[PDB]
Structures are given as structure tokens and as C-alpha cells.
Write a structure and sequence with these properties.
The protein is α/β, with parallel strands linked by helices and 362 residues long. It has 10 helices and 15 strands. An 8-stranded parallel barrel has the order 1-2-4-5-6-7-8-15, surrounded by 8 helices. Bound molecules: a molecule of 6 linked components (NAG-NAG-NAG-NAG-NDG-NAG) and a molecule of 2 linked components (NAG-NAG).
């Protein structure tokens, strides 16, 4: 099975032990490590961080002692904005410029492929997205025609039905992509005004779910139904949790909230907590297994957070295997306990390692 793991270029700037550099990554943990994110200037793929070139090499060095490890450079991301992507994939000239600039850039920096993370093509770009992927694969094929190891092309897709229906032509793009990572998380947000796990495996109690499609199981099946070969589908598992600030004494699923949770000491982002920040939170907190959804949530004081732990990711792997999917995708390596000092056991990357172990099991 493939174990696609993301690494973010901005985790390096986190205070103390929060700081994470590519050399802190276990070269044997994943099968594919994707760097996030690359920028796009003058219709050319380009670096984002001032020291990207250094971190690129720092990451690709992991391939020395592990020849099987594959590396990809992802372009896009949430903070990128669909606007910029649209103008490039929409204009016939810019699309060419962009596509042509990718292979050289990847070879120059030691990457094995490109990962498209365009969030998200509007209903107005559904076809342009198809053309982009179609031509990008064409170029990659051409660039390796003489006998090179062909560059890989992947795409991180939304797991939300509405977005999937208006943005993707699953059947068409599945032919050209080497593998698809479905972002099966971020299913519930403070905007909803109630507590809810952002990455449940199944819908669970029919009575308490605001949506029939906001869960991993639905998204996976839907995409399979739409024409995404199971052999090319990688299921996303989050190593971060979504938090909320409770508004009453109610702490169960669906309880009232006043907004996102208090920012974590290291990630400093309201509504977000890295798994390692969660391990701290768990000290003196109560953990509840959500029956039906197969995932846990912890609560302490006026804070509530839905996340994934070793037990839940295990179940999720079981699910993906029973489904015969390509494997699991993790977001992100720098959100897992990479130091291995926060959750005890002195074990590094507990969640990701748990996923790896589960994939090899049975
Ligand atoms: C408004 C309304 O009422 N309408 C409703 C809709 O909202 C509902 O749809 C839902 O919309 C939300 C957004 O509103 C969707 O959420 C997004 O989901 C995607 C995945 O599908 C997420 O993207 C990927 O996952 C991670 C984690 O979520 C993303 O975030 C990381 O990346 C950003 C930048 O790219 C990081 O930002 C960094 O921040 C630090 C400091 O904070 C800074 O120093 C860095 O510089 C900065 N980085 C950069 C480069 O700028 C951020 O910290 C990361 N987060 C975490 C945690 O790690 C990645 O970008 C994505 N990864 C990949 C591989 O692409 C996306 O993050 C998320 N957006 C938000 C705001 O959280 C949601 O999917 C929709 N739901 C569904 C199911 O479709 C709609 C449906 O219910 O209902 C409407 O009514
Ligand atoms: C990524 O590339 C874009 C180019 O599209 C850069 O955006 C420019 O930002 C500067 C201000 O910082 C503006 O003066 C330009 O007009 C912007 N260009 C446009 C039209 O978007 C962006 O700065 C780059 N990001 C990084 C991290 O380097």
C-alpha cells in the first residue's frame, strides 16, 4: 500500500519543539513524502519559502539510505486561492508555460513528481481542471519518452460532495492521475455552531448528523462510484484535530459552541491543534469514543476537540483495506508527534507509525 505523507514548509518556523525540518523526518516511515507547497509566479512553478531549495535537498536526502522513498512537490494548498490557479489553467498560453516549467524544476530539485492541490476548481473550471491534468501527464510522458523514470502526477481532492460535484470530473481525470488523495477531514467547522468531529469514519447516529455526506465512508464510496479506481485512491487521515469553545455544560456531539477552540501553543491557530498539542490537552481531559463514527473527541473545561489517535487510525486503515484502496494519506507529518516527546512512549510519529503498522498487518 502507498503511504503518502505531507510535510509543510511553514512548520520550520514554530517555537521550540514545534519547529520541524525535513531532516527530522523518518525516511522509512512513508512511501511518498509530499512537500507543501510550491508557488506559481509568471505562470512558472517556483519556490515559496526563502530557504525552500535547502529544505528540498534536506528532504530528498532522505532518499539516499532509502531508494524506494518517492518524493513529490505539491502546488496549491488552501491559502493559495483558487483565483490564481484558475487564470493559469484557464488561459491556453499560461497553461503551457506552467506545464513546460514543471519537469525542469522537479528534475533540478530532485523531486519524483508533482501534486496538484487546487482548492478548488469552481463549476466554472471543472473542464479546465481536466485539461490541466490531461496535458500535465502528457508533458511528463514526453519528458521521459527517451527512457527516464516518468514523473508522477497526483491530486489532492476535496472530500465534500458539493465541491466534488461542481469541481471534478472524477472518471476523466482518474485516467491521467497516478493516484488521488481524498481529503477526508475538515468535515465539520465552527461555522456550523455545534461540536462535531471533523473526520468521522462513518455517519454514526443518524439523528445527530447535520449532513448525510460529511464523513469518510460516504466520500470514499461516492468517489469510487464516480469512477475513481480503488487502486488509485488514497484515503486521507488527519494528524490534527478541530477544536471548539463550548458555550454550556453540554459536551457531547452537537453541543453548543461560541466559536473555534483556543489556539495551540505551537500551531497558534484557533480551531486547530496538532496531535502533539492534543496529547498535552489530554492531560486531565476526558476522551469519548463516538459510537458509529469510530473516532474520539476530548473535552476539558470549555474546550472540545475532535481528532484521530492510534485506535481510530487503525480502524480507518482496516476500512481502506476492506475497500481495497491504494493506501492512506497523512496530513501532516509535522502535526504528528514527530518529536515523540509529547505523547510519551518516546515513540516518534505515533499516528503515522500506527497507520504504517496497520497497513502491513494481517
Ligand atoms: C462559509 C459557509 O458557511 N459555507 C460552508 C462551507 O464552508 C462548507 O465547506 C467547507 O469549507 C471549508 C472552508 O470554508 C473547507 O475547509 C478546507 O478543507 C481543505 C480540505 O478539503 C483544507 O485543505 C487541506 O488541508 C489542510 C488542513 O485543513 C490545509 O491547511 C493547511 O494549509 C494552510 C495554507 O495552505 C496553512 O496555513 C498556514 O498558516 C500558518 C499560520 O496559521 C502560516 O504561518 C503559513 O504561512 C500558512 N501556510 C500558507 C502557505 O499560507 C494551515 O495552517 C494548514 N492547516 C493545517 C491544520 O495543517 C491545506 O492547505 C490542505 N492540504 C492540501 C494537501 O491541500 C483547508 O485547510 C480547509 N480550509 C480551512 C479554512 O480550514 C471544507 O473542506 C468544506 N467542507 C466540505 C466537506 O467540503 C460547506 C460544506 O459543509 O457548507 C457551506 O455551508
Ligand atoms: C507567489 O507568486 C505570486 C505571483 O503571482 C506573488 O504575488 C505577488 O506578490 C507581490 C506582493 O508580495 C505583488 O506585488 C504582486 O503583484 C503579486 N503578484 C500577483 C499578481 O499575484 C507571491 O508573492 C509569491 N509568493 C511567495 C511566497 O513568494
Amino acid at each position: 500500500y502507498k503511504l503518502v505523507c505531507y510535510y509543510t514548509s511553514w512548520s520550520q518556523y514554530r517555537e521550540g519543539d514545534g519547529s520541524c525540518f525535513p531532516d527530522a523526518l523518518d525516511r522509512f516511515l512513508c512511501t511518498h513524502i509530499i512537500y507543501s507547497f510550491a508557488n506559481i509566479s509568471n505562470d512558472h512553478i517556483d519556490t515559496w519559502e526563502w530557504n525552500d531549495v535547502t529544505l528540498y535537498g534536506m528532504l530528498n536526502t532522505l532518499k539516499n539510505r532509502n531508494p524506494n522513498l518517492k518524493t513529490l512537490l505539491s502546488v496549491g494548498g488552501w491559502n493559495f486561492g483558487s483565483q490564481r490557479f484558475s487564470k493559469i489553467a484557464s488561459n491556453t498560453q499560461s497553461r503551457r508555460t506552467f506545464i513546460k516549467s514543471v519537469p525542469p524544476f522537479l528534475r533540478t530539485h530532485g523531486f519524483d513528481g508533482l501534486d496538484l492541490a487546487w482548492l478548488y476548481p469552481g463549476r466554472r473550471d471543472k473542464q479546465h481542471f481536466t485539461t490541466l491534468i490531461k496535458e500535465m501527464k502528457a508533458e511528463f510522458i514526453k519528458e521521459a519518452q527517451p527512457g527516464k523514470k516518468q514523473l508522477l502526477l497526483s491530486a489532492a481532492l476535496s472530500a465534500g460532495k458539493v465541491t466534488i460535484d461542481s469541481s471534478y470530473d472524477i472518471a476523466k481525470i482518474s485516467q491521467h492521475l497516478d493516484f488521488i488523495s481524498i481529503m477526508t477531514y475538515d468535515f465539520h467547522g465552527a461555522w456550523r455552531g455545534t461540536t462535531g468531529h471533523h473526520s468521522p469514519l462513518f455517519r454514526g447516529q443518524e439523528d445527530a448528523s447535520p449532513d448525510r455526506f460529511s464523513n469518510t465512508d460516504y466520500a470514499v464510496g461516492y468517489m469510487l462510484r464516480l469512477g475513481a479506481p480503488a487502486s488509485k485512491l488514497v484515503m486521507g487521515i488527519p494528524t490534527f484535530g478541530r477544536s471548539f469553545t463550548l458555550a454550556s455544560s453540554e459536551t457531547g456531539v452537537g453541543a453548543p459552541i461560541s466559536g473555534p477552540g483556543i489556539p495551540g501553543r505551537f500551531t497558534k491557530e484557533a480551531g486547530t491543534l496538532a496531535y502533539y498539542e492534543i496529547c498535552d490537552f489530554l492531560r486531565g481531559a476526558t476522551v469519548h469514543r463516538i459510537l458509529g463514527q469510530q473516532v474520539p473527541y476530548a473535552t476539558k473545561g470549555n474546550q472540545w476537540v475532535g481528532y484521530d489517535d492510534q485506535e481510530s487510525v487503525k480502524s480507518k486503515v482496516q476500512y481502506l483495506k476492506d475497500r481495497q484502496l491504494a493506501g492512506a494519506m497523512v496530513w501532516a507529518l509535522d502535526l504528528d508527534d514527530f518529536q515523540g516527546s509529547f505523547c510519551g512512549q518516546d515513540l516518534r510519529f505515533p499516528l503515522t507509525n500506527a497507520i504504517k503498522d496497520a497497513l502491513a498487518a494481517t
